[PDB]
Amino acid sequence: MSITETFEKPQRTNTLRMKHGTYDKLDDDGLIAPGVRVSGEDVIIGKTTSKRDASTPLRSTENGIVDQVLVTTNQDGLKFVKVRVR
Amino acid sequence: EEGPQVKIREASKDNVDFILSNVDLAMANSLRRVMIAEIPTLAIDSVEVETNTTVLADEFIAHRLGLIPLQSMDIEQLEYSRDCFCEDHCDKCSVVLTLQAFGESESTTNVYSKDLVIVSNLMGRNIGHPIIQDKEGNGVLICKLRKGQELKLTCVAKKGIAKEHAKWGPAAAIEFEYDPWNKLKHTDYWYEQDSAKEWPQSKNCEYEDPPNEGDPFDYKAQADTFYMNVESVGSIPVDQVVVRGIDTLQKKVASILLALTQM
Amino acid sequence: MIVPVRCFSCGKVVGDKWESYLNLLQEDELDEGTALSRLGLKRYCCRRMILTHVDLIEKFLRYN
Amino acid sequence: MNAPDRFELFLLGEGESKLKIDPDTKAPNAVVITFEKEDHTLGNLIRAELLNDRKVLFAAYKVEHPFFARFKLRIQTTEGYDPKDALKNACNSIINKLGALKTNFETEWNLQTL
Amino acid sequence: ATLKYICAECSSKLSLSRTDAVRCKDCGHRILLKARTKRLVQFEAR
Ligand SMILES: [Zn+2]
Ligand SMILES: [Zn+2]
Ligand SMILES: [Zn+2]
């Protein structure tokens, strides 16, 4: 009931559910941007619920290079993101 | 001039066919291996991509860049980047090249390796230049654009050996044969009905006396004469694949004497 | 996707031969093998290179 | 990944030498030298010359695993003839005969057109 | 002066976010592309 999620670079605000990896590569929307190398268990998508963390990292055995980040809405209106890595 | 004897039979800007005569197989094969593996040469080995709206990916492009052969006659006078005291690269250890392309035309615009601009100071050592061997002087096709598409890059070239990656190899194929008749019985010929009808005669047989059916096998003979043919890709002229080849060995061996001395 | 720059096996440059090969077929009407031998691609390793390339980039370039 | 850099095939780690020379226990006047960042190129060549030397009783080389560029050469010689001397004598031939050949070649190549 | 987003379709630097919508300026198309860092990216050519 507005118990919402938000793409956004998170930080450490009194709940801190964050990840064993870096958020240092996301932009202010919470999304790497094409061109950047990624790796390790690097975060690729930043997300939140103050701070219940909903944020995706690169598969542990993988590394590559962001290639496209694509953002849209669903039929039902949800912002989607899709990131492809190469 | 006593010792290992030479005998060119053909030569061309691109190949040199010859006969080594009075040497061991080992030295002959070793010089083959050196020509393939260890003659220094210059090659794009870092590429920074400012823009690429191309239909290829960057590493796809980069890889192709490291393969364009680049002039390398003066490569003794470029230091290995790892030996140089600069931070990273500089003019003593590196040529830097640029590439910009934009699909200005409606029709499809190709990017070739002549579109490569050197941007660093050569000190008038003949190195760096994209090599060009086609009638139209385009050299290699790197990419293709559509109207609106862009590619901007820089590259750094660096001296390197094919051990490390084959892009640094000056040689292409190296023909190498010996004992065309089979007189040495180093090989035993597979056949259905007749070994001689069924295997083709080498071109190198004319050069060498057929054996005579009586002739009981020669146990003492050794492999003393080698029909070679070295083919160059062009970053180094040919004669120079050989001579820097011979020269690279001779230095490997000397680093061994130098290191006995240091014991 | 594009002509590869060299023969995977022998290193010979071959990426400067694609436009010519295709000119030698369509403009001067040779059969594929006579054409390859004219560009000096005489071992079967290099011949396989040009003869079996597929220029997929020509399809990729039709997208906007 | 797990892939050792390619530079490792020609270039010495921290604390490694070009040669390590060790006495062979099996037989007399015998040594085993391990050459680092080298391979057959040199190893088959030194070896084959050591055998044109009649004070050479034994010589042989091997690369024990293909993943490392290192070879091991074993020389045995007659009593009074140091093996390390047989390897200067042999490296010295090599360098001489090649000397020779880069000259016979540099020559044959001006006698030349195209 | 800048980039942030791109239009998948009608090819045109948009730049926007939250209470902004997720559509466009001179096509109305709901699909957007993130747009390349300026941090410069280097490749080994191997
Ligand atoms: Zn430097
Ligand atoms: Zn080939
Ligand atoms: Zn639009």
Coordinates of C-alpha atoms and ligand atoms in Angstrom, one line a residue:
Chain A
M1 CA 0.0 0.0 0.0
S2 CA 2.7 2.5 -1.3
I3 CA 5.2 -0.3 0.5
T4 CA 7.0 0.5 -2.8
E5 CA 10.3 -0.3 -4.6
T6 CA 12.5 2.3 -6.2
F7 CA 15.5 2.0 -8.5
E8 CA 18.0 4.0 -6.8
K9 CA 21.6 3.8 -5.8
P10 CA 21.1 2.8 -2.0
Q11 CA 23.7 3.5 0.8
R12 CA 23.2 2.7 4.6
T13 CA 20.0 4.3 6.1
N14 CA 18.9 2.5 9.4
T15 CA 18.1 -1.2 7.8
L16 CA 21.2 -1.5 5.3
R17 CA 20.2 -5.0 3.6
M18 CA 22.9 -4.7 1.1
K19 CA 25.2 -7.0 -0.8
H20 CA 28.6 -8.7 -0.3
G21 CA 29.5 -6.8 -3.8
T22 CA 30.0 -2.9 -4.9
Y23 CA 27.4 -0.6 -5.7
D24 CA 30.1 1.9 -6.9
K25 CA 29.2 1.4 -10.7
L26 CA 25.6 2.4 -10.7
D27 CA 24.4 5.8 -11.8
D28 CA 21.9 8.0 -9.7
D29 CA 18.9 5.9 -11.3
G30 CA 20.4 2.8 -10.1
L31 CA 21.7 1.3 -13.4
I32 CA 25.0 0.8 -14.9
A33 CA 25.4 2.3 -18.2
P34 CA 26.7 0.9 -21.3
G35 CA 30.4 0.6 -21.6
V36 CA 31.3 -0.2 -18.1
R37 CA 33.2 -3.4 -17.2
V38 CA 31.5 -5.6 -14.7
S39 CA 32.6 -8.5 -12.7
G40 CA 32.7 -10.3 -9.4
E41 CA 29.3 -10.0 -7.9
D42 CA 29.1 -6.2 -9.0
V43 CA 25.7 -4.7 -8.6
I44 CA 24.0 -4.0 -11.9
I45 CA 20.7 -3.0 -10.8
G46 CA 20.1 -0.9 -7.6
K47 CA 16.8 -1.3 -5.7
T48 CA 15.1 -0.6 -2.3
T49 CA 12.0 -0.8 0.1
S50 CA 13.9 2.7 5.1
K51 CA 16.4 0.5 3.2
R52 CA 15.0 -3.1 2.5
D53 CA 17.5 -3.8 -0.4
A54 CA 16.0 -5.5 -3.8
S55 CA 19.0 -5.3 -5.9
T56 CA 20.5 -7.6 -8.5
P57 CA 24.1 -8.6 -9.0
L58 CA 26.1 -10.1 -11.8
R59 CA 26.1 -13.9 -11.6
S60 CA 29.1 -14.9 -9.4
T61 CA 31.1 -16.8 -12.3
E62 CA 30.7 -14.1 -14.9
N63 CA 32.3 -10.9 -16.1
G64 CA 31.8 -8.8 -19.2
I65 CA 30.8 -5.4 -20.3
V66 CA 27.4 -3.8 -20.1
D67 CA 25.9 -3.6 -23.5
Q68 CA 22.5 -2.3 -23.4
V69 CA 20.2 -0.9 -20.7
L70 CA 16.7 -0.7 -21.5
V71 CA 13.9 0.8 -19.6
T72 CA 10.3 0.7 -20.0
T73 CA 6.8 0.1 -18.7
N74 CA 4.6 -3.0 -18.6
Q75 CA 0.6 -3.3 -19.7
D76 CA -0.1 -3.0 -16.0
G77 CA 2.4 0.1 -15.7
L78 CA 5.4 -1.2 -13.8
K79 CA 8.9 0.3 -14.8
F80 CA 11.0 -2.6 -16.0
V81 CA 14.5 -2.7 -16.6
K82 CA 16.4 -4.9 -18.7
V83 CA 20.2 -5.1 -18.7
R84 CA 22.2 -7.0 -21.1
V85 CA 25.7 -7.8 -20.6
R86 CA 28.3 -8.9 -23.0
Chain B
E1 CA 82.1 -19.1 -46.7
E2 CA 82.2 -22.6 -44.8
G3 CA 79.5 -23.8 -42.8
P4 CA 75.8 -23.8 -43.6
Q5 CA 75.3 -23.1 -47.1
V6 CA 72.5 -21.1 -48.8
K7 CA 71.0 -21.2 -52.3
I8 CA 68.0 -19.0 -53.1
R9 CA 65.8 -20.2 -56.0
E10 CA 63.2 -17.7 -56.0
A11 CA 62.5 -14.4 -54.3
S12 CA 60.0 -12.0 -54.3
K13 CA 59.0 -9.2 -51.9
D14 CA 56.6 -11.7 -50.3
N15 CA 58.5 -15.0 -50.3
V16 CA 61.9 -16.3 -50.7
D17 CA 62.3 -19.9 -51.5
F18 CA 65.7 -21.5 -50.6
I19 CA 67.8 -24.6 -49.8
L20 CA 69.9 -24.9 -46.7
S21 CA 72.7 -27.4 -47.4
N22 CA 75.3 -28.6 -45.0
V23 CA 73.4 -28.2 -41.6
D24 CA 71.7 -30.5 -39.0
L25 CA 68.0 -31.0 -39.0
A26 CA 67.9 -29.5 -35.6
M27 CA 69.3 -26.1 -36.6
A28 CA 67.1 -26.1 -39.7
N29 CA 63.9 -26.7 -37.6
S30 CA 64.9 -24.5 -35.0
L31 CA 65.3 -21.6 -37.4
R32 CA 61.8 -22.5 -38.8
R33 CA 60.5 -22.3 -35.3
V34 CA 62.1 -19.0 -34.6
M35 CA 60.8 -17.5 -37.7
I36 CA 57.3 -18.5 -36.7
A37 CA 57.6 -17.7 -33.0
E38 CA 60.1 -15.2 -31.9
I39 CA 61.0 -12.3 -34.2
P40 CA 59.8 -9.0 -32.7
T41 CA 57.3 -7.0 -34.5
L42 CA 54.8 -4.2 -33.9
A43 CA 51.1 -4.6 -33.3
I44 CA 48.0 -2.8 -32.0
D45 CA 47.8 -4.0 -28.4
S46 CA 45.5 -1.5 -26.7
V47 CA 42.5 0.1 -28.1
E48 CA 40.2 2.9 -26.3
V49 CA 36.9 3.4 -27.8
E50 CA 35.4 6.8 -27.7
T51 CA 32.5 6.0 -29.9
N52 CA 31.0 2.9 -31.8
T53 CA 27.6 2.9 -33.1
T54 CA 28.9 0.2 -35.6
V55 CA 27.0 -3.1 -36.0
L56 CA 30.1 -4.9 -34.5
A57 CA 31.1 -4.9 -30.8
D58 CA 34.2 -3.3 -29.5
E59 CA 36.4 -6.3 -28.6
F60 CA 35.3 -7.7 -32.0
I61 CA 36.7 -4.5 -33.6
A62 CA 39.8 -4.5 -31.2
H63 CA 40.8 -7.9 -32.0
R64 CA 40.7 -7.1 -35.6
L65 CA 42.8 -4.0 -35.0
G66 CA 45.6 -6.2 -33.3
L67 CA 45.7 -8.2 -36.4
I68 CA 46.4 -5.4 -39.0
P69 CA 50.0 -5.7 -39.8
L70 CA 51.9 -2.5 -39.1
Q71 CA 55.4 -1.6 -40.4
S72 CA 58.1 -3.0 -38.3
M73 CA 61.5 -2.6 -40.3
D74 CA 62.8 -0.3 -37.4
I75 CA 61.6 -2.3 -34.5
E76 CA 65.0 -2.8 -32.9
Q77 CA 64.9 0.9 -32.1
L78 CA 61.6 0.6 -30.2
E79 CA 62.0 -0.6 -26.7
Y80 CA 59.5 -3.2 -25.1
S81 CA 57.1 -1.3 -23.1
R82 CA 57.9 -3.4 -20.1
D83 CA 61.6 -2.5 -20.3
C84 CA 60.9 1.2 -20.6
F85 CA 61.1 3.6 -17.8
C86 CA 58.0 5.5 -18.8
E87 CA 54.8 5.4 -16.8
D88 CA 52.7 3.2 -19.1
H89 CA 53.6 4.2 -22.8
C90 CA 55.4 6.8 -24.7
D91 CA 57.3 7.4 -27.8
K92 CA 60.2 5.2 -26.9
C93 CA 57.9 2.0 -26.5
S94 CA 54.8 2.9 -28.6
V95 CA 53.2 4.2 -31.7
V96 CA 49.7 5.6 -31.1
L97 CA 47.2 5.4 -34.0
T98 CA 43.8 7.0 -34.6
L99 CA 40.7 6.0 -36.2
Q100 CA 37.6 8.1 -37.0
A101 CA 34.8 7.2 -39.3
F102 CA 31.5 8.3 -40.0
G103 CA 29.0 7.1 -42.5
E104 CA 28.5 10.1 -44.5
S105 CA 27.4 8.5 -47.7
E106 CA 23.9 7.1 -48.3
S107 CA 25.6 3.9 -49.7
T108 CA 27.9 1.9 -47.2
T109 CA 31.0 3.2 -46.1
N110 CA 33.9 0.9 -45.5
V111 CA 36.7 1.5 -43.0
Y112 CA 40.1 0.3 -44.0
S113 CA 43.4 0.3 -42.4
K114 CA 44.7 3.1 -44.5
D115 CA 42.2 5.2 -42.5
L116 CA 44.6 4.8 -39.6
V117 CA 46.4 7.9 -38.6
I118 CA 49.6 7.8 -36.6
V119 CA 49.5 10.6 -33.8
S120 CA 52.8 10.2 -32.0
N121 CA 56.2 11.0 -32.7
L122 CA 58.1 8.5 -34.7
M123 CA 61.7 9.9 -34.5
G124 CA 61.8 8.9 -38.3
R125 CA 62.1 5.1 -37.5
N126 CA 60.2 3.5 -40.3
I127 CA 57.4 1.9 -38.0
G128 CA 53.8 2.1 -37.4
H129 CA 52.4 2.4 -40.9
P130 CA 49.6 0.2 -41.9
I131 CA 51.0 -2.2 -44.5
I132 CA 49.1 -2.1 -48.0
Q133 CA 49.5 -4.6 -50.6
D134 CA 46.3 -4.4 -52.6
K135 CA 46.0 -2.7 -56.0
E136 CA 43.6 -0.1 -54.6
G137 CA 45.8 0.6 -51.5
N138 CA 43.0 0.1 -49.1
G139 CA 44.7 -2.6 -47.0
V140 CA 42.5 -4.4 -44.6
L141 CA 38.8 -4.0 -44.1
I142 CA 38.1 -3.3 -40.6
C143 CA 34.5 -2.4 -40.5
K144 CA 31.5 -1.1 -42.4
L145 CA 29.1 1.7 -41.7
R146 CA 25.7 2.6 -42.4
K147 CA 24.7 6.2 -43.0
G148 CA 24.6 7.7 -39.3
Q149 CA 27.0 5.4 -37.7
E150 CA 30.2 6.3 -36.1
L151 CA 33.4 4.8 -34.8
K152 CA 36.2 6.7 -32.9
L153 CA 39.1 5.0 -31.4
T154 CA 42.6 5.2 -30.3
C155 CA 45.1 2.4 -30.5
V156 CA 48.5 1.9 -29.0
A157 CA 50.9 -0.4 -30.7
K158 CA 53.7 -2.2 -28.9
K159 CA 56.5 -4.5 -29.8
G160 CA 55.7 -8.1 -29.2
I161 CA 56.5 -11.8 -30.1
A162 CA 54.1 -14.4 -31.7
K163 CA 54.7 -16.7 -28.5
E164 CA 52.7 -14.1 -26.8
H165 CA 50.1 -13.8 -29.4
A166 CA 50.1 -14.6 -32.9
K167 CA 49.3 -11.1 -34.1
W168 CA 52.9 -10.3 -33.6
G169 CA 54.1 -12.9 -36.0
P170 CA 55.8 -11.8 -39.2
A171 CA 55.8 -15.1 -40.9
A172 CA 53.0 -16.9 -42.5
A173 CA 53.4 -20.4 -43.7
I174 CA 56.9 -21.9 -43.9
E175 CA 57.3 -24.6 -46.4
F176 CA 59.9 -27.1 -45.1
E177 CA 60.9 -30.5 -46.6
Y178 CA 63.9 -32.8 -46.9
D179 CA 64.7 -36.0 -48.5
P180 CA 62.0 -35.9 -51.1
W181 CA 62.9 -39.4 -52.5
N182 CA 62.8 -41.5 -49.4
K183 CA 66.1 -42.4 -49.1
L184 CA 66.8 -41.9 -45.5
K185 CA 63.5 -44.1 -44.7
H186 CA 62.5 -41.5 -42.3
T187 CA 58.9 -42.2 -43.3
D188 CA 57.1 -45.3 -44.3
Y189 CA 54.6 -45.0 -47.0
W190 CA 51.1 -46.2 -46.7
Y191 CA 49.6 -47.7 -49.9
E192 CA 47.1 -50.0 -51.3
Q193 CA 48.8 -51.5 -54.4
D194 CA 51.9 -49.4 -55.0
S195 CA 53.6 -46.8 -52.8
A196 CA 55.1 -44.9 -55.9
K197 CA 52.0 -44.8 -58.1
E198 CA 50.0 -43.7 -55.2
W199 CA 52.1 -40.8 -53.6
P200 CA 52.8 -37.7 -55.6
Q201 CA 56.4 -36.7 -56.3
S202 CA 57.6 -33.6 -54.6
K203 CA 58.8 -30.6 -56.7
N204 CA 62.0 -30.8 -54.7
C205 CA 62.7 -34.3 -56.2
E206 CA 64.3 -32.9 -59.6
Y207 CA 66.9 -31.3 -57.4
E208 CA 68.3 -34.5 -56.1
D209 CA 69.3 -37.9 -57.7
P210 CA 66.5 -40.7 -57.6
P211 CA 67.9 -43.7 -55.8
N212 CA 68.9 -47.0 -58.0
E213 CA 66.9 -50.2 -57.1
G214 CA 70.1 -52.3 -56.4
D215 CA 71.5 -49.7 -54.0
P216 CA 71.4 -51.5 -50.5
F217 CA 70.1 -49.0 -48.0
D218 CA 72.4 -46.4 -46.8
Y219 CA 72.8 -46.6 -43.0
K220 CA 75.2 -43.7 -42.6
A221 CA 73.3 -41.0 -44.4
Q222 CA 72.1 -38.0 -42.5
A223 CA 69.6 -35.1 -43.3
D224 CA 71.9 -32.4 -44.6
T225 CA 69.7 -30.6 -47.2
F226 CA 66.4 -28.7 -46.7
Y227 CA 64.0 -27.2 -49.0
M228 CA 62.5 -24.1 -47.4
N229 CA 60.2 -21.2 -48.4
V230 CA 59.3 -18.4 -46.1
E231 CA 56.4 -16.3 -46.7
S232 CA 56.0 -12.8 -45.1
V233 CA 52.9 -11.1 -44.1
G234 CA 54.6 -7.9 -44.8
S235 CA 55.3 -6.1 -41.6
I236 CA 59.0 -7.0 -42.2
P237 CA 60.3 -7.8 -45.6
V238 CA 61.3 -11.2 -46.1
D239 CA 64.9 -11.6 -46.3
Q240 CA 64.6 -10.0 -43.0
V241 CA 62.3 -12.8 -41.6
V242 CA 65.2 -15.0 -42.2
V243 CA 68.0 -12.8 -41.1
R244 CA 66.4 -11.6 -37.9
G245 CA 65.4 -15.2 -37.4
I246 CA 69.0 -16.4 -37.6
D247 CA 69.8 -13.4 -35.4
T248 CA 67.2 -14.2 -32.8
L249 CA 68.4 -17.7 -32.2
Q250 CA 72.0 -16.5 -32.0
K251 CA 71.0 -14.1 -29.3
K252 CA 69.1 -17.0 -27.3
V253 CA 72.1 -19.0 -27.3
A254 CA 74.3 -16.1 -26.2
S255 CA 72.0 -15.4 -23.2
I256 CA 73.0 -18.9 -22.2
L257 CA 76.8 -18.2 -22.3
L258 CA 76.1 -15.0 -20.5
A259 CA 74.5 -16.9 -17.8
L260 CA 77.1 -19.5 -17.3
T261 CA 79.5 -16.4 -16.8
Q262 CA 77.2 -15.3 -14.2
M263 CA 77.4 -18.5 -12.2
Chain C
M1 CA 30.3 -11.4 -39.7
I2 CA 33.2 -9.7 -41.8
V3 CA 36.0 -11.2 -43.7
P4 CA 38.4 -12.3 -41.0
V5 CA 41.7 -10.4 -41.1
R6 CA 44.0 -13.6 -41.4
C7 CA 43.7 -17.3 -42.2
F8 CA 43.2 -18.9 -38.8
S9 CA 45.8 -21.4 -39.6
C10 CA 48.8 -19.9 -41.5
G11 CA 48.4 -16.1 -40.5
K12 CA 48.3 -14.9 -44.2
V13 CA 46.4 -11.7 -44.4
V14 CA 43.2 -12.4 -46.2
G15 CA 41.1 -9.4 -45.1
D16 CA 42.3 -7.2 -47.8
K17 CA 41.0 -9.7 -50.4
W18 CA 37.3 -9.7 -49.9
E19 CA 36.1 -6.8 -52.4
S20 CA 38.4 -8.1 -54.9
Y21 CA 37.1 -11.7 -54.8
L22 CA 33.7 -10.6 -55.1
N23 CA 34.7 -8.2 -58.0
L24 CA 36.4 -11.2 -59.6
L25 CA 33.3 -13.2 -59.7
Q26 CA 30.6 -10.8 -60.7
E27 CA 32.7 -8.3 -62.9
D28 CA 35.0 -10.8 -64.7
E29 CA 33.0 -13.9 -64.5
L30 CA 35.5 -16.4 -63.0
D31 CA 34.5 -19.5 -61.2
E32 CA 35.2 -19.3 -57.4
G33 CA 38.3 -21.4 -57.5
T34 CA 40.1 -19.5 -60.3
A35 CA 39.3 -16.4 -58.6
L36 CA 40.8 -17.5 -55.3
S37 CA 43.9 -18.6 -57.0
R38 CA 44.3 -15.3 -58.7
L39 CA 44.4 -13.6 -55.4
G40 CA 47.3 -15.8 -54.6
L41 CA 45.3 -17.9 -51.9
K42 CA 46.8 -21.2 -52.9
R43 CA 46.9 -23.2 -49.7
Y44 CA 43.5 -24.9 -48.8
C45 CA 43.6 -23.2 -45.5
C46 CA 43.5 -19.7 -46.9
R47 CA 41.1 -20.8 -49.7
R48 CA 38.6 -22.1 -47.1
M49 CA 38.7 -18.6 -45.5
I50 CA 37.3 -16.7 -48.4
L51 CA 35.3 -19.5 -49.9
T52 CA 33.3 -20.2 -46.9
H53 CA 33.0 -16.6 -45.3
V54 CA 29.5 -15.4 -44.9
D55 CA 29.1 -11.5 -44.8
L56 CA 26.6 -11.3 -42.4
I57 CA 27.4 -7.6 -41.8
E58 CA 25.6 -6.8 -45.0
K59 CA 22.4 -7.9 -43.2
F60 CA 23.3 -6.2 -40.1
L61 CA 23.6 -2.9 -41.9
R62 CA 19.9 -3.0 -43.0
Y63 CA 18.7 -2.2 -39.5
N64 CA 18.3 1.5 -38.4
Chain D
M1 CA 40.2 -17.1 -15.1
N2 CA 42.8 -19.7 -14.2
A3 CA 45.1 -19.0 -17.6
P4 CA 48.8 -18.1 -16.6
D5 CA 49.7 -14.8 -18.7
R6 CA 51.4 -15.6 -22.0
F7 CA 54.4 -13.5 -21.1
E8 CA 55.2 -16.3 -18.7
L9 CA 56.4 -18.3 -21.6
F10 CA 59.5 -16.1 -22.3
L11 CA 60.1 -13.9 -19.2
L12 CA 61.5 -14.9 -15.7
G13 CA 59.4 -14.7 -12.6
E14 CA 60.7 -13.0 -9.4
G15 CA 63.6 -15.2 -8.1
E16 CA 63.8 -17.6 -11.1
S17 CA 67.2 -18.0 -13.1
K18 CA 67.9 -18.8 -16.7
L19 CA 69.9 -21.9 -15.6
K20 CA 70.0 -24.2 -12.4
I21 CA 72.8 -26.7 -12.6
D22 CA 72.7 -29.8 -10.5
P23 CA 75.0 -32.8 -10.1
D24 CA 73.7 -36.0 -11.3
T25 CA 73.8 -38.7 -8.7
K26 CA 73.1 -41.6 -11.0
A27 CA 76.5 -41.6 -12.9
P28 CA 79.8 -39.7 -12.9
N29 CA 80.7 -36.4 -14.6
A30 CA 77.1 -35.8 -15.1
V31 CA 75.0 -32.9 -14.7
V32 CA 71.4 -31.8 -15.2
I33 CA 70.7 -28.2 -16.2
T34 CA 67.2 -26.8 -16.1
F35 CA 66.6 -24.1 -18.5
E36 CA 63.7 -21.6 -17.7
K37 CA 61.6 -19.8 -20.2
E38 CA 62.8 -22.0 -23.0
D39 CA 61.4 -24.9 -25.0
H40 CA 62.3 -27.2 -27.8
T41 CA 63.8 -24.5 -30.0
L42 CA 66.9 -24.3 -27.9
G43 CA 66.6 -27.6 -26.2
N44 CA 66.7 -29.8 -29.3
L45 CA 69.6 -27.5 -30.7
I46 CA 72.0 -27.5 -27.8
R47 CA 71.3 -31.1 -27.4
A48 CA 72.1 -32.1 -30.9
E49 CA 75.4 -30.3 -31.0
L50 CA 76.5 -31.8 -27.7
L51 CA 76.4 -35.0 -29.6
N52 CA 78.8 -34.0 -32.4
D53 CA 81.4 -33.6 -29.4
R54 CA 83.2 -37.1 -29.0
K55 CA 84.0 -36.3 -25.3
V56 CA 80.2 -36.3 -24.9
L57 CA 79.1 -39.6 -23.5
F58 CA 75.4 -38.6 -22.9
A59 CA 73.1 -36.0 -23.8
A60 CA 69.3 -35.5 -23.7
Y61 CA 66.6 -33.1 -23.1
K62 CA 62.9 -33.0 -22.1
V63 CA 60.0 -30.8 -21.4
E64 CA 58.3 -32.5 -18.7
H65 CA 55.0 -30.8 -19.0
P66 CA 53.7 -28.7 -21.8
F67 CA 52.1 -26.2 -19.6
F68 CA 55.5 -24.9 -18.3
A69 CA 58.3 -23.4 -20.6
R70 CA 61.2 -25.1 -19.0
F71 CA 63.4 -28.0 -20.1
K72 CA 65.9 -30.1 -18.5
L73 CA 69.1 -31.2 -20.3
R74 CA 71.4 -33.9 -19.0
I75 CA 75.0 -34.1 -20.2
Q76 CA 77.5 -36.8 -19.2
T77 CA 81.3 -36.4 -20.4
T78 CA 84.6 -38.1 -20.1
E79 CA 86.7 -37.9 -17.0
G80 CA 88.5 -34.6 -16.9
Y81 CA 86.0 -32.8 -19.2
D82 CA 83.5 -30.6 -17.3
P83 CA 80.1 -30.8 -18.7
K84 CA 79.5 -27.0 -18.3
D85 CA 82.6 -26.7 -20.6
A86 CA 80.8 -28.9 -23.1
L87 CA 77.9 -26.7 -23.2
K88 CA 80.1 -23.6 -23.8
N89 CA 81.8 -25.6 -26.5
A90 CA 78.4 -26.4 -27.9
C91 CA 76.7 -23.1 -27.5
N92 CA 80.0 -21.5 -29.3
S93 CA 79.6 -23.9 -32.3
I94 CA 76.1 -23.0 -32.7
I95 CA 76.5 -19.2 -32.7
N96 CA 79.5 -19.7 -35.2
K97 CA 77.5 -21.7 -37.6
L98 CA 74.8 -19.4 -37.6
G99 CA 77.1 -16.3 -37.8
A100 CA 78.0 -18.2 -41.0
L101 CA 74.7 -18.8 -42.4
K102 CA 73.2 -15.2 -41.9
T103 CA 76.3 -14.1 -44.0
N104 CA 75.9 -16.8 -46.7
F105 CA 72.3 -15.7 -46.8
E106 CA 72.6 -11.9 -46.6
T107 CA 74.8 -12.6 -49.7
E108 CA 72.7 -14.8 -51.8
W109 CA 70.0 -12.3 -51.5
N110 CA 71.8 -9.3 -53.2
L111 CA 72.8 -11.6 -56.0
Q112 CA 69.0 -11.4 -56.5
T113 CA 66.2 -9.8 -58.5
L114 CA 62.6 -9.1 -57.5
Chain E
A1 CA 25.8 20.0 -23.2
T2 CA 24.8 16.2 -22.0
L3 CA 23.1 12.8 -23.1
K4 CA 21.5 10.6 -20.2
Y5 CA 18.6 8.4 -22.2
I6 CA 17.8 7.5 -25.9
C7 CA 14.7 6.5 -27.7
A8 CA 14.8 3.0 -28.9
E9 CA 12.7 3.8 -32.0
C10 CA 12.9 7.7 -33.2
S11 CA 16.5 7.9 -32.1
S12 CA 16.6 11.0 -29.9
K13 CA 18.2 12.0 -26.8
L14 CA 15.7 12.2 -24.2
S15 CA 16.8 12.8 -20.5
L16 CA 14.2 12.6 -17.7
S17 CA 13.1 10.4 -14.6
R18 CA 10.4 10.0 -11.6
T19 CA 7.0 11.9 -12.0
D20 CA 8.3 12.5 -15.5
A21 CA 6.5 9.5 -17.3
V22 CA 8.6 7.0 -19.4
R23 CA 7.7 7.9 -23.0
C24 CA 9.0 10.6 -25.3
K25 CA 9.6 14.0 -27.6
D26 CA 8.7 13.8 -31.3
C27 CA 7.6 10.1 -31.4
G28 CA 5.5 8.9 -28.4
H29 CA 7.3 5.5 -27.8
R30 CA 7.6 3.8 -24.5
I31 CA 11.1 2.2 -24.8
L32 CA 14.3 3.8 -23.7
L33 CA 17.9 3.2 -24.0
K34 CA 20.7 4.1 -21.4
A35 CA 23.5 5.6 -23.4
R36 CA 27.1 5.1 -23.2
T37 CA 29.4 6.1 -20.3
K38 CA 31.9 8.7 -21.0
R39 CA 34.4 6.8 -18.5
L40 CA 36.7 5.5 -21.3
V41 CA 37.0 1.8 -21.9
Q42 CA 40.0 0.0 -22.9
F43 CA 40.6 -3.3 -24.6
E44 CA 43.5 -5.5 -24.9
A45 CA 43.2 -6.5 -28.7
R46 CA 43.9 -10.0 -28.1
Ligands
ZN1 ZN 57.8 4.2 -22.7
ZN2 ZN 46.2 -20.3 -44.6
ZN3 ZN 11.1 8.9 -29.7

